[PDB]
Amino acid sequence: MHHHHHHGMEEVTIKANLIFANGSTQTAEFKGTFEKATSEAYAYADTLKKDNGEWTVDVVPKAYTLNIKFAG
Ligand SMILES: [Zn+2]
Ligand SMILES: [Zn+2]
Ligand SMILES: [Zn+2]
Numbered sequence: 001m002h003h004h005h006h007h008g009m010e011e012v013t014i015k016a017n018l019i020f021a022n023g024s025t026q027t028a029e030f031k032g033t034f035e036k037a038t039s040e041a042y043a044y045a046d047t048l049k050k051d052n053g054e055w056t057v058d059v060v061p062k063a064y065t066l067n068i069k070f071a072g
Contacts, residue, residue, distance in 0.1 A: 002059050006034070011031070011032070012032070013037075014038060014041055015062075016030060016044070028041070
């Protein structure tokens with residue numbers, strides 16, 4: 001499944017792609033912890049439910065940092 005594994009001091013950027021029933025789209029950016037950034041994106045989507053209907057989301061990571069530590 002789509003599991004978010006929280007890290008302390010995490011800072012991520014979320015690019016939300018809003019796709020409407022008629023094929024038109026809208027994009028917006030959100031920043032902060034994953035929890036904070038996604039909740040703002042979902043709150044935003046909820047403000048559009050009135051005129052655009054129910055929505056579903058797919059979370060797709062695009063960039064990562066790998067911290068590789070050598071013991072010596
Ligand atoms: Zn986990
Ligand atoms: Zn998190
Ligand atoms: Zn997915």
